[PDB]
Design a protein around this ligand. Structure first.
Ligand SMILES: O=C(/C=C/c1ccc(O)c(O)c1)OCCc1ccccc1
Ligand SMILES: O=C(/C=C/c1ccc(O)c(O)c1)OCCc1ccccc1
Lengths: 109, 115, 115, 109
């Protein structure tokens, strides 16, 4: 698992479950090509987005649909979504509040 | 001043100075059109991006060039940039302060919205 | 103004107003002695806690009463309070801004230190 | 495992390893009694601090020695340590930078 995303809910103190996200890879013409996607599990984790062979050097974007998540809970959010854009084992963690988010990368051997 | 951005450096415990950022607005055809740009001052703040007349309802994107900031300090950061995308003014004019806190492998953003 | 504290509310996207906090200084006998206290204003800021003369070298603790803040809004938060403990002025006088961002189950604190 | 702590390093993008912390429980005379302690593993996690039987309702303090961690890396930190004080399955996560820290609780069934 070369890429995993973990999402947490700072309002309810829980994993953020059923959070949808898409992963994009930047193409030569500088547009974003869909690469992978999924929803966080009950543990707020999304695994198996890609494989080692497939996960080559490049600029990747993770677009997390935080807006739909807050809407399903009945809470008005500030952001349309949360993006994480980086040059590429990776774990991306995102901590969500209605008017704030934080994201960190844990890059290991 | 309906839109202000403040950027802080969590490694040095200082304002993040001379951080470039570009603001875009989503056009009718769903493309990002350039709206405004600037660099943070010695206090880590960027004022005067726009005016109340210009800052109409819409979806806005603030793209903060955190990578060049970290690189100029000898650090290779994780993120290409930090984005903030939000719908603005859809219930009438508001004032928005976007605050970003930067580390090489992490960032956080919060918004303060006032009437 | 050598010590200022700014508190923001991540749920409402607003300054956190009327947040009480107490500042303590570590005494010679290793106990926390009361140093100063106050409440945040309508802009989420607390100024005038101390002066340059009073604010000598030492270890300081700022205890922010986040629990009462959340409770007054009908939320049962996780944390009793948010603390910031730091050595101040040991290389000469500095100015400290302590920023806290609050959610019911989370908080973040950062310091901006200037000469 | 009713209580676990996870610590991450926002400067190096890694788990924070060998971070020492003590856990205290507030006593009737309102002082802090030592309760448990340990160091984070290579995954930045600290497990087995307590048991279900032992982990009763009360006010707990987790005092994380972030200062020694930054010092061992050669970086001057702002904080003496990072405290997490709460009324009590709990996971406390802390994300560390030299002049900043964030902490969140994930409270599950
Ligand atoms: O749960 C997390 C991080 C939660 C968290 C903490 C602080 C934050 O500010 C934030 O936004 C999120 O870390 C998981 C990463 C990980 C996974 C496997 C092995 C090693 C490391
Ligand atoms: O300096 C700030 C916020 C800095 C900060 C704090 C915590 C963070 O996690 C972060 O990323 C940034 O406050 C400015 C916002 C403001 C605007 C108008 C009125 C009141 C407050």
């Amino acid at each position: 698992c070369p890429l995993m995303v973990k999402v947490l809910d700072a309002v309810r103190g829980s994993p953020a479950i059923n959070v949808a996200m898409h992963v994009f890879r930047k193409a030569a013409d500088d547009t974003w090509e869909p690469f992978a996607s999924g929803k966080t599990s009950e543990s707020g984790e999304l695994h198996g987005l890609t494989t080692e062979e497939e996960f080559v050097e490049g600029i990747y974007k993770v677009e997390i649909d935080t807006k739909s998540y807050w809407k399903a809970l009945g809470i008005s959010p500030f952001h349309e979504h949360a993006e994480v854009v980086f040059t590429a084992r990776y774990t991306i963690a995102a901590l969500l509040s209605p008017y704030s988010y934080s994201t960190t990368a844990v890059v290991t051997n």
